[PDB]
Amino acid sequence: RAAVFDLDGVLALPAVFGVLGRTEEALALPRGLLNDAFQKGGPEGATTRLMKGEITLSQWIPLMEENCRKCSETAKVCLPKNFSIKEIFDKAISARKINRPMLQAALMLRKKGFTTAILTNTWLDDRAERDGLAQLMCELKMHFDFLIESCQVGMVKPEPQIYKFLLDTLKASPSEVVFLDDIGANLKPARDLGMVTILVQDTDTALKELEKVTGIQLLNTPAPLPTSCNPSDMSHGYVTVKPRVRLHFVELGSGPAVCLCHGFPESWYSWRYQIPALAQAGYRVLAMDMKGYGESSAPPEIEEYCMEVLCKEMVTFLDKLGLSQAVFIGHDWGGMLVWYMALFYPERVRAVASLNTPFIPANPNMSPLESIKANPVFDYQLYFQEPGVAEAELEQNLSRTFKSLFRASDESVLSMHKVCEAGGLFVNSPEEPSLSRMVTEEEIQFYVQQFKKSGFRGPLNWYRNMERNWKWACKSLGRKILIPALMVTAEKDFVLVPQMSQHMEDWIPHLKRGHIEDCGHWTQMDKPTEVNQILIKWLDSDARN
Amino acid sequence: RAAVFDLDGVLALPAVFGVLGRTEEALALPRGLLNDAFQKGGPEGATTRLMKGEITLSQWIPLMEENCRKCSETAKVCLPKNFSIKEIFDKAISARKINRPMLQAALMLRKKGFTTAILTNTWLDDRAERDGLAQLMCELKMHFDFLIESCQVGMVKPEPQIYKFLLDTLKASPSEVVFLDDIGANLKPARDLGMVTILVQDTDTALKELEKVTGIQLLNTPAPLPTSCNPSDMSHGYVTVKPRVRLHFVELGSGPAVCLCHGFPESWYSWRYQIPALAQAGYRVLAMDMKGYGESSAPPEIEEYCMEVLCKEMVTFLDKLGLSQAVFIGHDWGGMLVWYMALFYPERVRAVASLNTPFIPANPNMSPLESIKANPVFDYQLYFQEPGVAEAELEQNLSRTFKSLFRASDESVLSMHKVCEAGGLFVNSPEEPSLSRMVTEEEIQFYVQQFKKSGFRGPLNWYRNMERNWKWACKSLGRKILIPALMVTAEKDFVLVPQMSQHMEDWIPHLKRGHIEDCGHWTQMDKPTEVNQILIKWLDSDARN
Numbered sequence A, B: 001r002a003a004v005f006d007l008d009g010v011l012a013l014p015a016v017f018g019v020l021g022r023t024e025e026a027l028a029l030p031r032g033l034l035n036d037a038f039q040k041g042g043p044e045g046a047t048t049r050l051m052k053g054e055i056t057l058s059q060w061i062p063l064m065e066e067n068c069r070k071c072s073e074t075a076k077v078c079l080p081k082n083f084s085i086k087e088i089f090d091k092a093i094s095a096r097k098i099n100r101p102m103l104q105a106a107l108m109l110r111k112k113g114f115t116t117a118i119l120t121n122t123w124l125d126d127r128a129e130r131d132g133l134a135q136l137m138c139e140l141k142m143h144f145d146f147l148i149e150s151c152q153v154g155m156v157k158p159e160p161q162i163y164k165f166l167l168d169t170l171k172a173s174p175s176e177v178v179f180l181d182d183i184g185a186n187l188k189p190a191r192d193l194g195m196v197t198i199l200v201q202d203t204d205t206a207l208k209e210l211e212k213v214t215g216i217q218l219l220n221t222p223a224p225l226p227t228s229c230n231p232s233d234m235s236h237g238y239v240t241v242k243p244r245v246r247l248h249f250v251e252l253g254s255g256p257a258v259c260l261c262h263g264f265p266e267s268w269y270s271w272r273y274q275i276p277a278l279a280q281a282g283y284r285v286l287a288m289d290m291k292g293y294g295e296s297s298a299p300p301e302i303e304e305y306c307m308e309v310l311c312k313e314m315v316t317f318l319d320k321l322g323l324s325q326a327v328f329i330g331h332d333w334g335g336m337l338v339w340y341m342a343l344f345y346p347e348r349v350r351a352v353a354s355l356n357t358p359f360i361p362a363n364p365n366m367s368p369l370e371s372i373k374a375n376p377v378f379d380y381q382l383y384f385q386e387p388g389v390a391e392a393e394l395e396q397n398l399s400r401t402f403k404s405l406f407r408a409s410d411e412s413v414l415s416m417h418k419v420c421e422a423g424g425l426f427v428n429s430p431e432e433p434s435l436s437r438m439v440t441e442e443e444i445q446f447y448v449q450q451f452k453k454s455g456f457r458g459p460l461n462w463y464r465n466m467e468r469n470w471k472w473a474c475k476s477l478g479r480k481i482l483i484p485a486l487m488v489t490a491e492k493d494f495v496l497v498p499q500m501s502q503h504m505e506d507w508i509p510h511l512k513r514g515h516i517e518d519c520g521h522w523t524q525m526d527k528p529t530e531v532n533q534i535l536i537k538w539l540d541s542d543a544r545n
């Protein structure tokens, strides 16, 4: 089945066309005058030339002016002193926003296997403010299989040929397609060809008709998840920071650079729900494969994964990309890394935020090993110390590893206490775990394929530098973090517990906080919507300025 | 040999330290008061803690205030009502600019085989305006082999240990190193260790001493070329636009996106002289391998290289990167592509500029083949038509191909007239051309290695769509280009001659122009300095806003 949506008055409101009407009233012009001038000449008039791509919007403005003068002349009325078609359309175009419920329905239909398309009468926009529209189309168009624009195909609704062209690109028969439009005249040829047609006035009634005919719930459905990433559709970047070390990243959006740093044992892909949201919010997102992971290099030496070297390489990464600063947002081990970036390279850090991981200053009077002992839930970290032991258990069955790890707070385990005595992470774990509700089998297989390259040696080495990190961290014991900073705690992270962050204000006076209840350790995919809301509010506040 | 430069008062002026003096005068304070408060406590004072990285600049401010109060108390003077150390240093830091002649000397020394370094007493900067400094250090640091900062190594000049640390990272003996500094006290330990030392007051005298001791001309040398790109040091991006098509690009900088499009038969690397300049000027540069080239995909089908498909893929490229617009700058075939982007996708084009290639509207009354015949210098294009003929000649000896093509206007040939009758491009060409003054043997071998992947089939296919491009271009004959536009002509391009652009104002009313005399077809490497000046002035005018 197929579903086809118009843009103006359907996926975007208010219909620019509906501004003519409101404008007429405001200026106290005769009803319909502006709409009349707009369509004047029908098939051979200025506006049809515009919609077929014969001329640009800026060439059209003067033509529209002329039609307005002729219409006012005929109607025996005068147009206002500073009457300006340029200004009127600027405002109408800018006012138009995405109709979220209609978009949501479109996403549901595609998710359930429909091929979807936007078919729109539109123009080539060369106005100085054309970027606003450019941004609208971009956001919408990514959610659809096809976008057919009159000005690119040289055809316009309601000409019968464009409907045949639609069916051809849909590779579907008319009876297999639903077509939604707010303009009855433009529906007729669709109906004539035999497709199901919906006349959109109010969105809710339209979606009622739409769910009735497709047999799929579209109205009053549960809150959808944020948009995710298809790895194959992303821009992949590669930067050599040292002769044998290259960092891979995925990049999306424009605006202030935002560098996302994942935890153990994860991937750039762990940010899949924030990447599109942050980009759409006006940021240039750079989601790293951290050293040891995925398409980034994974040298064997333990020392290659100490915080001092990892931080230095992140600075080099910025240097090579030509960035003086980025905002750094980290989760888990990535969260610890970003605190040290703030502490040692404040000049390069526009702002810093950590999910789950608190900033804990080094204790100069206690070995890090001792500190780890003094906390039952930290037992698995000692298990990780001896090279080879954990690698073997984690690498044995990768699908099992990730299905056991990536689980919501209710779906547990694992129980990271008494792991050493038990003799392993999964010693009490099923061979074939159920799939957690947070992930799909396909998402799990992505992580599986990523870890086939380098395995767990690199990732585990992040844990094998306790003494070295402690020494380096001690150098910072006189400092405070005084750049913009955000700490997000997760109620149900049973290792990185919210109370671990209780004293951070001592080191970070102006610290801002967020808190997510009913949220386990895997914050980004556990509660993506709330994560996105927290980060975006904080970015627009403390980074973007 | 090695050369080591201080930052403040050497590679950057004025020395922030020299603001204390000017500030004292402006406020009519006792001479030296501010400088005294700044150094108070010597080895154990607040400022030494700052320079060793014990505390940040923002923690230091209050300490400096206190020292100022104590000094004024002792001197029996009062400090002004709104005396503010924060404000004073903000201004001093911002005023500091790169000392271009000193940098130039450093570049020459490195070019001639010196290992170079910056050794600086500096601080961890967590001020709200820290990015200004971040940007200074970034620009400087890329030109040096090492940067040693006191606050990162926990040592400060003039402590003897930092000089030993310098020598260790230089891997050189004292007698092999020259050390330039504006502070005599900081030179002594260097001199004591036996290195050559230069006390920098005025830059010119310092460079006089420097050239005398190195035996290399540093003063009043010819204008250097702009900074180039080392392919291994760049960020490389990859985007799949279609199942079998991926576009590779190099990316540098932040700010408005600027997409550079090369010509035939070139590479992203053809922009090597503009990439660093444009980034430094405040743009995010994306230099493409165009379809058919380098690390981009090279499908065999001729139709894959028509303008309609190439343009559509560039739009998809923007879509996947999350960019609503980019400025498009093209040269040669890239220049033609960018004109069509402006014409068919104005919404996505922030601004458009072409080097050499004029915009020539399609002639609806003449086949493109006919038009090509009507111009002797276009003869080589007919030679290119039949698949396989030109590929064989261009692929036979790649080094020869590029050494013959990439030549300044005086160093010619080739003579692209009567190529068909002659039976080939190089039929009158030497087997082993001399190396043009525009390129090095190493640059030539880069192009050689790039074309080993896909050869010339893809690139030649750009020429094999004359009829198809003409048909598509005819659809635009009613339009004008009304977005910001720049045409740069080159006096000595004997194919894309400046007079070919004479009527462009008819189609592009607000067209801006640049013109480069004594410039051949290979504009970017022929006259990189002037290209950079023209583009940057136009960007800051018509794109950046």
Ligand SMILES: CS(=O)(=O)c1ccc([C@@H](CCNC(=O)c2ccc(C#N)cc2)c2ccc(F)cc2)cc1
Residues within 6 Å of the ligand: A263, A264, A265, A332, A333, A336, A357, A380, A405, A409, A413, A414, A415, A416, A425, A492, A493, A494, A495, A496, A520, A521
């Ligand atoms: C029981 S639960 O709440 O669901 C939960 C589940 C999984 C984990 C993570 C934790 C990984 N992170 C760190 O070990 C870490 C340590 C120090 C700093 C510092 N500084 C940062 C991260 C984990 C644990 C064991 C694994 F084999 C894989 C992943 C945490 C809580």
Ligand SMILES: CS(=O)(=O)c1ccc([C@@H](CCNC(=O)c2ccc(C#N)cc2)c2ccc(F)cc2)cc1
Residues within 6 Å of the ligand: B263, B264, B265, B332, B333, B336, B357, B380, B405, B409, B413, B414, B415, B416, B425, B492, B493, B494, B495, B496, B520, B521
């Ligand atoms: C004699 S000189 O002045 O030094 C000179 C040297 C080399 C060239 C370039 C020209 C390539 N470009 C185009 O053929 C082109 C055509 C139409 C549009 C359009 N629209 C764009 C480019 C060239 C020519 C032959 C080659 F084998 C390789 C490269 C031009 C002038």
